[PDB]
């Protein structure tokens, strides 16, 4: 490497530790890496930022997909990548975004903890915005592959108040959000797999409970499938014709009997959680939660559902001007 | 992944360059090499990347993406900034990750570069490949930042398949037009024109070669045929250069004239 080229680059190189104040401000730690609530040290902005140190050193498949995709994707419901910092000494990659004070994991946890001890169209607006961001990804042949409440961020106070931001494109290639074809050995991720995850989220927004909640290498997972059949019922041959084609179909036949789930249906489940089966919300949930992926509704068809034309209409701000009762995120003392 | 998004992509918005800006940045290397020798070096390194990709059993799309990363790097930076012998396998290694082929192991990437240069390019390289994985990893960081993290690259292959399918001439024209698209990587075309325009120029040259009348199909296109003719002239010029160039006889001399990285004090 040319020395003059190297010192010039090193002199011009923006370092994350010099630009942002984030030590002690970790709000997330997972397979994605570490997410911090950061502030600019130069103080020309008073905005909060989200700084992510990607997991591992160098550019993994995960980091590569997240950078490659977020560098192109531009949609109001997809988290926007501002900057990439490449720390040469430790080979760490940092990604900068706007800070979303909220996410669906915390919002749902807040409602769940309340039932133990929402504005009218908040759930509808969250679903419409998730559908809008996923439809943009799918129109661009991008599968999320890991949709869950935790990576569905929602902006707090500011110019984008209550706007959903879909996060985490780094899934390069619990199971409560995994479509049943994945649990039966499906060899590829599809748009339908994302749609099933959106259906799980929608049901959880309506009831505050993970619809396919289940106890903690092989793609086949008995208890998770059992929970799905306890909620949905056991698929008949006519409901999912190509189920015979799944690699784990004979394992499903050996471990399960249809009659066990004879009084099981999405209608009965949602009835227990006080959601009316005759509502447009229920009919849309059922179209998203279809066992056979080829029979699952598309994100664009979901956006056209009459549920979104029924009062109340979805709003740009999911909180619809209402005081946000949700607390701010807590800082993890990561050691 | 990102198919259909060309007009809103970083490839179009940042990496479709102005020919004069490109020629201006090249002047620093043209102090050591003639324009002809600089072109021959780009032909040479496109062939090195192709050979590295073949050795690693990579799909043509991975090889093409790696070739574009290499061209984008030397479109903005001098041949002396980083050794192109280290840059070429580094481009292949990163493209294989972007194209979701996988992480080529340290031993596999180093053995493939050592083996390809030794068995296929010893006319240009008397010594064995001297770089190790730490160098490739260092280079990867530099290549990523110096491309502004733009990893999604569009190639003429997909629009070409759509055009020959529309023509109903796949069996006759696709093999040749596809090979001509491979040849366009020996030139600066991917840095100057949208891929669908390079695909049309290749398809046009294939029709001329195979004496297939396609004037009406080409006239029914809502495209700037002047830009298509500019690309066709670049392809015809490459064939004349290819004919007059003997890469095996000339590359050891051209590589010696090339500016080399300055060591630290
Ligand atoms: C309270 O625990 C979490 C806070 C996390 C958070 C808070 C604010 N901003 C972000 N991001 C901005 C853009 C991305 F870098 C993520 N992430 C989100 N959560 C996660 O699980 C999570 C799953 N995948 C990713 C990623 N990547 C995060 C819950
Ligand atoms: Cl069903």
Coordinates of C-alpha atoms and ligand atoms in Angstrom, one line a residue:
Chain A
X1 CA 0.0 0.0 0.0
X2 CA 1.3 3.5 -0.9
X3 CA 2.4 5.3 2.2
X4 CA 1.2 8.8 1.0
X5 CA -2.2 7.2 0.1
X6 CA -2.4 5.5 3.5
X7 CA -1.6 8.6 5.7
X8 CA -3.9 10.9 3.7
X9 CA -6.7 8.3 4.1
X10 CA -6.0 7.9 7.8
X11 CA -6.0 11.8 8.2
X12 CA -9.3 12.2 6.4
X13 CA -10.9 9.1 8.1
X14 CA -13.9 9.8 10.2
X15 CA -13.7 7.8 13.4
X16 CA -16.9 6.8 15.3
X17 CA -15.2 7.5 18.7
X18 CA -14.4 11.0 17.6
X19 CA -17.8 11.8 16.1
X20 CA -20.2 10.3 18.6
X21 CA -20.7 10.1 22.3
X22 CA -22.1 6.7 23.0
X23 CA -20.1 5.0 25.8
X24 CA -22.5 3.7 28.4
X25 CA -25.5 4.3 26.0
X26 CA -26.0 0.7 24.7
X27 CA -29.7 0.0 24.2
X28 CA -29.4 -3.3 22.3
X29 CA -27.1 -6.4 22.2
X30 CA -27.8 -9.4 20.0
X31 CA -26.6 -11.4 17.0
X32 CA -26.7 -8.1 15.1
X33 CA -24.1 -6.6 17.4
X34 CA -24.4 -3.6 19.7
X35 CA -26.8 -0.7 19.3
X36 CA -26.2 2.6 21.1
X37 CA -28.1 5.8 21.5
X38 CA -25.5 8.3 20.4
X39 CA -25.0 12.1 20.2
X40 CA -22.7 14.1 18.0
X41 CA -19.6 15.4 19.8
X42 CA -19.3 18.4 17.5
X43 CA -22.8 19.5 18.8
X44 CA -24.1 21.0 15.5
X45 CA -27.2 18.7 16.0
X46 CA -29.1 18.0 19.2
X47 CA -30.7 14.8 17.5
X48 CA -30.3 11.4 19.0
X49 CA -28.7 8.8 16.7
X50 CA -28.6 5.0 16.6
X51 CA -25.1 3.6 16.3
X52 CA -24.6 -0.1 15.6
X53 CA -21.3 -1.9 16.0
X54 CA -21.9 -5.0 13.8
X55 CA -21.2 -8.4 15.4
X56 CA -17.7 -9.8 14.8
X57 CA -14.7 -8.4 13.0
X58 CA -14.4 -7.6 9.3
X59 CA -17.2 -7.8 6.8
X60 CA -19.3 -10.9 7.6
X61 CA -22.1 -12.2 5.3
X62 CA -24.5 -10.5 7.7
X63 CA -22.7 -7.1 7.7
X64 CA -22.2 -7.3 3.9
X65 CA -26.0 -7.8 3.3
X66 CA -27.0 -5.1 5.8
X67 CA -24.6 -2.5 4.2
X68 CA -25.3 -3.6 0.5
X69 CA -29.0 -3.4 0.9
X70 CA -29.4 -0.3 3.2
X71 CA -27.0 1.5 0.9
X72 CA -29.8 1.2 -1.9
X73 CA -33.1 1.0 0.0
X74 CA -35.0 4.3 0.4
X75 CA -38.5 4.1 1.9
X76 CA -40.1 6.0 4.9
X77 CA -40.9 2.7 6.6
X78 CA -37.4 1.2 6.3
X79 CA -34.6 2.4 8.7
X80 CA -32.3 4.7 6.7
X81 CA -28.5 4.2 6.7
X82 CA -26.7 7.5 7.2
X83 CA -23.1 6.5 7.4
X84 CA -20.7 3.6 7.6
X85 CA -17.5 3.9 9.7
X86 CA -14.8 1.2 9.2
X87 CA -12.5 1.0 12.2
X88 CA -9.2 -0.3 10.8
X89 CA -7.4 -1.1 14.0
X90 CA -10.0 -3.5 15.4
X91 CA -11.7 -4.3 12.1
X92 CA -15.1 -3.2 13.4
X93 CA -18.0 -1.9 11.3
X94 CA -20.3 0.9 12.6
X95 CA -23.6 1.9 11.0
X96 CA -25.4 5.2 11.7
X97 CA -29.1 5.7 11.7
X98 CA -31.7 8.1 13.2
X99 CA -32.7 6.9 16.7
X100 CA -36.1 5.4 17.1
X101 CA -37.1 5.7 20.7
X102 CA -39.7 2.9 20.3
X103 CA -40.0 -0.6 18.9
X104 CA -42.9 -3.1 18.9
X105 CA -41.2 -5.4 21.4
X106 CA -41.3 -2.6 24.0
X107 CA -44.7 -1.2 23.0
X108 CA -46.2 -4.7 23.2
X109 CA -44.4 -5.5 26.5
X110 CA -45.9 -2.3 27.9
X111 CA -49.5 -3.3 27.0
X112 CA -48.9 -6.9 28.2
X113 CA -47.5 -5.7 31.6
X114 CA -50.6 -3.5 31.9
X115 CA -53.2 -6.4 31.5
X116 CA -51.2 -8.1 34.3
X117 CA -51.4 -5.1 36.7
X118 CA -53.8 2.4 22.5
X119 CA -55.3 5.1 20.3
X120 CA -58.1 3.8 18.0
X121 CA -56.1 3.2 14.8
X122 CA -52.6 2.6 16.3
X123 CA -52.6 -1.2 15.6
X124 CA -54.1 -0.6 12.1
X125 CA -51.5 2.1 11.4
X126 CA -48.6 0.0 12.6
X127 CA -49.8 -2.9 10.4
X128 CA -50.3 -0.6 7.3
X129 CA -46.8 0.9 7.8
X130 CA -45.2 -2.6 8.3
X131 CA -47.0 -3.7 5.1
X132 CA -45.8 -0.6 3.2
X133 CA -42.2 -1.1 4.2
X134 CA -42.3 -4.9 3.5
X135 CA -44.0 -4.3 0.1
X136 CA -41.2 -1.9 -0.8
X137 CA -38.6 -4.5 0.2
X138 CA -40.5 -7.3 -1.7
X139 CA -41.0 -5.1 -4.8
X140 CA -37.2 -4.9 -4.8
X141 CA -36.7 -8.7 -4.3
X142 CA -35.5 -8.2 -0.7
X143 CA -36.7 -10.6 1.9
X144 CA -36.4 -9.5 5.5
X145 CA -36.2 -13.2 6.7
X146 CA -36.5 -12.3 10.4
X147 CA -39.4 -10.0 11.0
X148 CA -40.3 -9.7 14.7
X149 CA -41.6 -6.9 17.0
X150 CA -38.0 -6.1 18.1
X151 CA -36.8 -5.1 14.6
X152 CA -40.0 -3.0 13.9
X153 CA -38.9 0.4 15.3
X154 CA -41.3 3.3 15.7
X155 CA -40.0 6.9 15.8
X156 CA -40.6 8.9 19.0
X157 CA -41.0 12.8 19.3
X158 CA -39.7 14.7 16.3
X159 CA -40.4 15.3 12.6
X160 CA -41.2 11.5 12.1
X161 CA -43.3 10.9 15.2
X162 CA -45.0 7.5 15.2
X163 CA -43.5 6.4 11.9
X164 CA -42.6 2.7 11.6
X165 CA -39.0 1.9 10.6
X166 CA -38.3 -1.7 9.6
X167 CA -34.8 -2.6 10.9
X168 CA -32.2 -5.3 10.4
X169 CA -31.4 -6.4 6.8
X170 CA -28.5 -8.5 8.1
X171 CA -30.1 -11.9 8.2
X172 CA -27.9 -13.3 5.4
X173 CA -28.4 -16.9 4.4
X174 CA -37.5 -18.4 19.5
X175 CA -39.4 -19.5 16.4
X176 CA -42.8 -17.8 17.3
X177 CA -42.7 -15.8 14.0
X178 CA -41.4 -18.7 11.8
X179 CA -43.9 -19.8 9.0
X180 CA -44.8 -23.5 9.3
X181 CA -43.1 -24.4 5.9
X182 CA -39.8 -23.3 7.6
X183 CA -40.6 -25.7 10.5
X184 CA -41.2 -28.5 7.9
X185 CA -37.8 -28.2 6.1
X186 CA -38.5 -25.5 3.4
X187 CA -35.1 -24.9 1.6
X188 CA -35.6 -21.3 0.7
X189 CA -36.9 -18.0 2.2
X190 CA -39.8 -16.5 0.3
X191 CA -42.0 -13.4 0.5
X192 CA -44.7 -15.6 2.1
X193 CA -42.4 -16.3 5.1
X194 CA -42.3 -12.5 5.8
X195 CA -46.1 -12.3 5.3
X196 CA -46.6 -15.0 8.0
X197 CA -44.4 -13.0 10.4
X198 CA -46.5 -9.9 9.8
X199 CA -49.6 -12.0 10.6
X200 CA -48.0 -13.1 13.9
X201 CA -47.2 -9.4 14.7
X202 CA -50.7 -8.2 13.8
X203 CA -52.3 -10.9 16.1
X204 CA -49.9 -9.9 18.9
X205 CA -50.7 -6.2 18.4
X206 CA -54.5 -7.0 18.8
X207 CA -54.1 -9.3 21.9
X208 CA -50.7 -8.3 23.5
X209 CA -49.7 -12.0 23.4
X210 CA -47.4 -13.8 20.9
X211 CA -50.0 -15.9 19.0
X212 CA -47.6 -18.8 18.5
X213 CA -45.9 -18.5 22.0
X214 CA -43.9 -21.6 22.8
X215 CA -41.3 -22.9 25.2
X216 CA -37.5 -22.7 24.4
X217 CA -29.8 -27.3 14.0
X218 CA -32.8 -29.4 12.9
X219 CA -35.3 -27.3 11.0
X220 CA -38.2 -29.4 12.4
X221 CA -39.5 -28.2 15.8
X222 CA -42.3 -30.2 17.4
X223 CA -43.5 -27.8 20.1
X224 CA -43.6 -24.8 17.8
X225 CA -45.7 -26.7 15.2
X226 CA -47.9 -28.1 18.0
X227 CA -48.6 -24.4 19.2
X228 CA -49.5 -23.5 15.6
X229 CA -51.9 -26.4 15.3
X230 CA -53.3 -25.6 18.8
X231 CA -54.1 -22.1 17.5
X232 CA -54.9 -22.6 13.7
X233 CA -56.0 -26.3 13.7
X234 CA -54.4 -29.1 11.7
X235 CA -54.2 -28.3 8.0
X236 CA -56.4 -30.6 5.9
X237 CA -55.0 -32.0 2.6
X238 CA -57.1 -29.4 0.7
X239 CA -55.8 -26.5 2.8
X240 CA -52.2 -27.2 2.0
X241 CA -51.8 -29.6 -0.9
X242 CA -48.0 -29.3 -1.3
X243 CA -47.5 -30.2 2.4
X244 CA -46.7 -33.8 1.2
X245 CA -43.6 -32.2 -0.6
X246 CA -42.1 -30.8 2.6
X247 CA -38.9 -32.6 3.7
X248 CA -40.3 -33.2 7.2
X249 CA -43.9 -34.2 6.1
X250 CA -43.4 -37.8 7.2
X251 CA -42.1 -36.6 10.6
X252 CA -45.2 -34.4 10.9
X253 CA -47.4 -37.5 10.2
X254 CA -45.5 -39.7 12.6
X255 CA -45.6 -37.1 15.5
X256 CA -49.1 -35.6 14.9
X257 CA -52.7 -36.6 14.5
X258 CA -55.3 -34.3 13.0
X259 CA -58.1 -35.1 15.5
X260 CA -56.0 -33.7 18.4
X261 CA -56.7 -30.2 17.0
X262 CA -60.3 -30.9 16.0
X263 CA -61.8 -27.9 18.1
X264 CA -58.9 -25.6 17.2
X265 CA -59.2 -22.6 14.9
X266 CA -58.0 -19.0 14.5
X267 CA -61.7 -17.9 15.0
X268 CA -61.8 -19.6 18.5
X269 CA -58.4 -18.3 19.4
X270 CA -59.2 -14.7 18.5
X271 CA -62.6 -15.0 20.2
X272 CA -60.9 -15.9 23.5
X273 CA -58.8 -12.7 23.1
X274 CA -61.9 -10.6 22.5
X275 CA -61.3 -10.0 18.8
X276 CA -64.5 -10.3 16.7
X277 CA -64.3 -12.9 13.9
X278 CA -66.8 -10.9 11.8
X279 CA -64.5 -7.9 11.8
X280 CA -62.4 -6.8 8.8
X281 CA -59.3 -6.9 11.1
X282 CA -59.9 -10.7 11.7
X283 CA -60.5 -11.5 8.0
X284 CA -57.2 -9.7 7.2
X285 CA -55.4 -11.6 10.0
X286 CA -56.7 -14.9 8.6
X287 CA -55.5 -14.1 5.1
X288 CA -51.9 -13.3 6.5
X289 CA -51.9 -16.4 8.7
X290 CA -52.7 -19.0 6.0
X291 CA -50.8 -22.3 6.6
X292 CA -50.1 -22.9 2.9
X293 CA -47.6 -20.2 1.8
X294 CA -48.9 -20.2 -1.9
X295 CA -52.3 -19.3 -0.3
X296 CA -51.0 -16.5 1.9
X297 CA -52.0 -12.9 0.8
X298 CA -49.3 -10.6 -0.7
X299 CA -48.2 -7.4 1.1
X300 CA -49.7 -5.3 -1.7
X301 CA -53.0 -7.2 -1.5
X302 CA -53.0 -6.7 2.3
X303 CA -52.5 -2.9 1.8
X304 CA -55.6 -3.0 -0.4
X305 CA -57.8 -4.8 2.2
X306 CA -61.1 -3.0 3.1
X307 CA -59.9 -3.0 6.7
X308 CA -57.7 0.0 5.8
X309 CA -60.8 1.8 4.3
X310 CA -62.9 1.2 7.4
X311 CA -63.0 3.8 10.2
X312 CA -60.5 4.6 11.7
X313 CA -58.1 5.2 8.8
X314 CA -54.4 4.5 9.3
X315 CA -52.3 7.6 10.1
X316 CA -48.7 8.6 9.3
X317 CA -48.2 9.0 13.1
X318 CA -49.3 5.7 14.7
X319 CA -49.7 7.6 18.0
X320 CA -52.2 9.9 16.2
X321 CA -51.1 13.1 18.0
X322 CA -51.8 11.4 21.4
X323 CA -49.3 11.7 24.3
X324 CA -46.8 8.7 24.0
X325 CA -47.3 6.8 27.2
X326 CA -44.4 4.4 26.4
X327 CA -41.3 4.9 28.5
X328 CA -37.9 5.7 26.9
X329 CA -35.5 2.7 26.3
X330 CA -33.2 1.7 29.2
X331 CA -29.4 1.6 28.9
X332 CA -27.9 -1.9 29.2
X333 CA -24.8 -2.0 31.4
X334 CA -22.9 -4.3 29.1
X335 CA -19.8 -5.9 30.5
Chain B
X1 CA -32.1 -8.3 -4.9
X2 CA -32.7 -4.7 -6.0
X3 CA -33.7 -5.8 -9.6
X4 CA -35.8 -3.1 -11.1
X5 CA -34.2 -0.4 -8.9
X6 CA -31.5 0.8 -11.4
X7 CA -32.8 4.4 -11.7
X8 CA -32.7 4.9 -7.9
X9 CA -29.5 2.9 -7.3
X10 CA -26.0 4.0 -6.1
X11 CA -24.7 2.4 -9.3
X12 CA -26.6 4.9 -11.4
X13 CA -26.5 7.9 -9.1
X14 CA -22.8 7.7 -8.1
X15 CA -21.0 5.1 -10.3
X16 CA -22.1 6.1 -13.8
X17 CA -19.2 8.5 -14.5
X18 CA -18.5 11.4 -16.9
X19 CA -15.8 10.3 -19.5
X20 CA -13.9 13.6 -19.0
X21 CA -13.7 13.2 -15.2
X22 CA -12.4 9.6 -15.7
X23 CA -9.8 10.7 -18.2
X24 CA -8.8 13.5 -15.9
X25 CA -8.2 11.2 -12.9
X26 CA -6.3 8.8 -15.2
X27 CA -3.7 11.5 -16.1
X28 CA -1.7 10.8 -12.9
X29 CA -1.2 7.2 -14.1
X30 CA -0.6 8.4 -17.7
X31 CA 2.7 10.0 -16.6
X32 CA 4.1 6.4 -16.4
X33 CA 2.0 4.5 -19.0
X34 CA 0.6 5.4 -22.4
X35 CA -3.2 5.4 -22.9
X36 CA -2.7 2.1 -24.9
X37 CA -0.6 0.5 -22.1
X38 CA -3.1 1.6 -19.4
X39 CA -5.9 0.0 -21.5
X40 CA -3.9 -3.3 -21.9
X41 CA -3.3 -3.4 -18.1
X42 CA -7.1 -3.1 -17.6
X43 CA -7.7 -6.0 -20.1
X44 CA -5.0 -8.0 -18.2
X45 CA -6.5 -7.6 -14.8
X46 CA -10.0 -8.3 -16.1
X47 CA -8.6 -11.6 -17.3
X48 CA -6.9 -12.2 -13.9
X49 CA -10.2 -11.7 -12.1
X50 CA -12.0 -14.0 -14.6
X51 CA -9.3 -16.7 -14.0
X52 CA -9.5 -16.3 -10.2
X53 CA -13.3 -16.6 -10.3
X54 CA -13.2 -19.7 -12.6
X55 CA -10.6 -21.4 -10.2
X56 CA -12.9 -20.7 -7.2
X57 CA -16.0 -22.0 -9.2
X58 CA -17.8 -18.7 -8.9
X59 CA -20.7 -17.8 -11.1
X60 CA -20.1 -15.2 -13.9
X61 CA -22.2 -12.6 -11.9
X62 CA -19.8 -12.8 -9.0
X63 CA -16.8 -12.4 -11.4
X64 CA -18.6 -9.4 -13.1
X65 CA -19.3 -7.7 -9.8
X66 CA -15.6 -8.2 -8.7
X67 CA -14.5 -6.7 -12.0
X68 CA -16.6 -3.6 -11.6
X69 CA -15.3 -3.1 -8.0
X70 CA -11.7 -3.3 -9.4
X71 CA -12.6 -0.8 -12.2
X72 CA -14.3 1.6 -9.7
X73 CA -11.3 1.5 -7.4
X74 CA -8.8 2.4 -10.2
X75 CA -11.2 4.9 -11.8
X76 CA -10.7 7.1 -8.7
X77 CA -7.3 5.9 -7.5
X78 CA -3.8 5.4 -8.9
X79 CA -2.4 1.9 -9.8
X80 CA 0.3 2.7 -7.1
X81 CA -2.2 3.3 -4.2
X82 CA -2.8 -0.5 -3.8
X83 CA -1.1 -3.3 -5.7
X84 CA -3.7 -4.5 -8.3
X85 CA -2.3 -8.1 -7.7
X86 CA -3.7 -7.8 -4.1
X87 CA -6.8 -5.8 -5.2
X88 CA -8.0 -8.5 -7.8
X89 CA -8.5 -11.4 -5.3
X90 CA -9.8 -8.9 -2.7
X91 CA -12.5 -7.8 -5.2
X92 CA -13.4 -11.4 -5.8
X93 CA -13.5 -12.2 -2.1
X94 CA -15.9 -9.3 -1.4
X95 CA -18.1 -9.8 -4.4
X96 CA -18.6 -13.5 -3.4
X97 CA -20.1 -12.2 -0.1
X98 CA -22.4 -9.5 -1.7
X99 CA -23.6 -12.0 -4.3
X100 CA -24.4 -14.5 -1.3
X101 CA -22.0 -17.1 -2.6
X102 CA -20.2 -17.2 0.8
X103 CA -17.0 -16.4 2.5
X104 CA -14.1 -18.0 0.6
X105 CA -11.9 -19.5 3.2
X106 CA -8.4 -18.0 4.0
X107 CA -6.6 -21.0 2.6
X108 CA -8.8 -21.4 -0.4
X109 CA -8.6 -17.7 -1.5
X110 CA -4.8 -17.6 -1.0
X111 CA -4.2 -20.9 -2.7
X112 CA -6.4 -19.9 -5.6
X113 CA -4.5 -16.6 -6.1
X114 CA -1.1 -18.3 -5.7
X115 CA -2.2 -21.1 -8.2
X116 CA -3.9 -18.9 -10.8
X117 CA -1.0 -16.5 -11.1
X118 CA 1.6 -19.3 -11.2
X119 CA -0.1 -21.6 -13.7
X120 CA -1.9 -19.1 -15.9
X121 CA 0.0 -15.8 -15.6
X122 CA 3.7 -16.6 -15.1
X123 CA 4.5 -14.8 -18.4
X124 CA 3.7 -11.6 -16.3
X125 CA 4.6 -12.7 -12.8
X126 CA 8.0 -14.3 -12.2
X127 CA 7.5 -14.5 -8.4
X128 CA 4.9 -16.4 -6.4
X129 CA 1.8 -14.5 -5.0
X130 CA 3.3 -12.8 -1.9
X131 CA 0.1 -11.7 0.0
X132 CA -1.6 -13.4 2.9
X133 CA -5.1 -13.2 4.3
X134 CA -4.3 -10.3 6.6
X135 CA -3.5 -8.2 3.5
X136 CA -6.7 -9.2 1.7
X137 CA -8.6 -8.3 4.9
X138 CA -6.8 -5.0 5.1
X139 CA -7.5 -4.3 1.4
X140 CA -11.2 -5.2 1.8
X141 CA -11.6 -2.4 4.3
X142 CA -10.0 0.1 1.9
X143 CA -12.0 -1.2 -1.1
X144 CA -15.3 -1.0 0.8
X145 CA -14.8 2.6 2.0
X146 CA -13.3 3.9 -1.2
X147 CA -16.4 2.6 -3.1
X148 CA -18.6 4.6 -0.6
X149 CA -20.0 1.2 0.5
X150 CA -21.8 0.8 -2.9
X151 CA -22.0 -3.0 -3.3
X152 CA -25.1 -3.6 -5.5
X153 CA -23.9 -3.7 -9.1
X154 CA -26.1 -4.0 -12.2
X155 CA -24.8 -6.0 -15.2
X156 CA -26.0 -6.3 -18.9
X157 CA -26.7 -10.0 -18.6
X158 CA -30.3 -9.8 -17.1
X159 CA -31.5 -7.1 -19.6
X160 CA -29.7 -9.1 -22.4
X161 CA -31.8 -12.2 -21.5
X162 CA -35.0 -10.1 -21.6
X163 CA -34.0 -8.7 -25.0
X164 CA -33.2 -12.0 -26.7
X165 CA -36.4 -13.5 -25.2
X166 CA -38.4 -10.6 -26.7
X167 CA -36.6 -11.1 -30.0
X168 CA -37.5 -14.9 -29.9
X169 CA -33.8 -15.5 -30.9
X170 CA -32.3 -17.1 -27.8
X171 CA -30.8 -20.2 -29.5
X172 CA -29.1 -18.2 -32.2
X173 CA -28.1 -14.9 -30.6
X174 CA -27.8 -15.5 -26.8
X175 CA -24.4 -17.4 -26.8
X176 CA -22.6 -14.8 -28.9
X177 CA -24.3 -11.7 -27.3
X178 CA -23.5 -13.1 -23.8
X179 CA -19.8 -13.6 -24.9
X180 CA -19.7 -10.0 -26.2
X181 CA -21.1 -8.8 -22.9
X182 CA -18.1 -10.7 -21.3
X183 CA -15.8 -8.8 -23.6
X184 CA -17.2 -5.3 -22.6
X185 CA -15.5 -5.8 -19.2
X186 CA -12.2 -5.4 -21.0
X187 CA -13.2 -1.7 -21.5
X188 CA -14.5 1.3 -19.4
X189 CA -18.2 0.8 -20.6
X190 CA -19.6 -0.4 -17.2
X191 CA -18.4 2.9 -15.7
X192 CA -20.0 5.0 -18.5
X193 CA -23.3 3.5 -19.6
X194 CA -26.4 1.9 -18.0
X195 CA -26.2 -2.0 -18.3
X196 CA -29.3 -2.2 -20.6
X197 CA -27.5 0.0 -23.1
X198 CA -24.4 -2.2 -23.1
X199 CA -26.7 -5.3 -23.5
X200 CA -28.3 -3.6 -26.6
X201 CA -24.9 -2.8 -28.1
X202 CA -23.8 -6.4 -27.6
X203 CA -27.0 -7.8 -29.0
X204 CA -26.7 -5.5 -32.1
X205 CA -23.0 -6.6 -32.7
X206 CA -24.2 -10.3 -32.4
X207 CA -26.9 -9.6 -35.0
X208 CA -24.3 -8.1 -37.4
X209 CA -21.9 -11.0 -36.9
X210 CA -24.6 -13.6 -37.4
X211 CA -26.2 -11.6 -40.2
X212 CA -29.6 -11.4 -38.5
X213 CA -31.9 -8.6 -39.6
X214 CA -33.1 -6.8 -36.5
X215 CA -33.4 -3.2 -37.7
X216 CA -37.2 -3.1 -37.0
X217 CA -36.8 -4.6 -33.5
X218 CA -34.0 -2.0 -32.7
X219 CA -36.1 0.9 -34.2
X220 CA -39.1 0.0 -32.1
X221 CA -37.0 0.6 -29.0
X222 CA -37.5 3.8 -27.0
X223 CA -33.7 4.2 -26.6
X224 CA -31.0 6.8 -27.6
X225 CA -29.5 4.9 -30.6
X226 CA -26.6 7.5 -30.7
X227 CA -25.4 6.2 -27.3
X228 CA -25.9 2.6 -28.5
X229 CA -23.6 3.4 -31.5
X230 CA -21.0 4.9 -29.1
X231 CA -21.0 1.6 -27.3
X232 CA -20.8 -0.4 -30.5
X233 CA -17.8 1.6 -31.6
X234 CA -16.1 0.8 -28.3
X235 CA -16.8 -2.9 -28.8
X236 CA -15.5 -2.9 -32.4
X237 CA -12.4 -1.0 -31.2
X238 CA -11.7 -3.6 -28.5
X239 CA -11.6 -6.3 -31.2
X240 CA -9.0 -4.4 -33.2
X241 CA -7.0 -3.8 -30.0
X242 CA -7.4 -7.5 -29.0
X243 CA -6.1 -8.6 -32.4
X244 CA -3.0 -6.2 -32.2
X245 CA -2.3 -6.9 -28.5
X246 CA -0.2 -9.8 -27.3
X247 CA -0.8 -9.8 -23.6
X248 CA 1.7 -12.7 -23.0
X249 CA 4.5 -10.9 -24.8
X250 CA 3.8 -7.4 -23.5
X251 CA 2.5 -7.6 -19.9
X252 CA 5.8 -8.1 -18.0
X253 CA 7.1 -4.8 -19.6
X254 CA 3.8 -2.9 -19.0
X255 CA 3.6 -4.1 -15.3
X256 CA 7.3 -2.8 -14.8
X257 CA 6.3 0.7 -16.1
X258 CA 3.3 0.8 -13.8
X259 CA 3.6 3.1 -10.7
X260 CA 4.5 1.0 -7.6
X261 CA 3.4 1.7 -4.0
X262 CA 5.8 3.9 -2.1
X263 CA 7.1 2.3 1.1
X264 CA 6.9 4.0 4.5
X265 CA 9.9 6.2 5.7
Ligands
LIG1 C1 -34.3 -3.1 23.6 O1 -33.7 -4.0 22.7 C2 -33.6 -3.6 21.4 C3 -33.4 -2.2 20.8 C4 -33.0 -2.3 19.3 C5 -32.7 -1.0 18.6 C6 -33.1 0.2 19.1 C7 -33.0 1.3 18.2 N1 -32.4 1.2 17.0 C8 -32.1 0.0 16.6 N2 -31.6 -0.2 15.4 C9 -31.4 0.9 14.4 C10 -31.2 0.2 13.1 C11 -30.6 -1.1 13.5 F1 -29.2 -0.9 13.8 C12 -31.3 -1.5 14.8 N3 -32.2 -1.1 17.4 C13 -34.0 -3.1 18.5 N4 -34.1 -4.5 19.2 C14 -33.7 -5.6 18.6 O2 -33.8 -6.7 19.2 C15 -33.0 -5.6 17.2 C16 -33.1 -6.7 16.4 N5 -32.3 -6.5 15.3 C17 -31.6 -5.3 15.5 C18 -30.6 -4.8 14.6 N6 -29.9 -4.5 13.8 C19 -32.1 -4.7 16.7 C20 -34.6 -4.4 20.5
LIG2 CL1 -55.2 -22.1 6.7

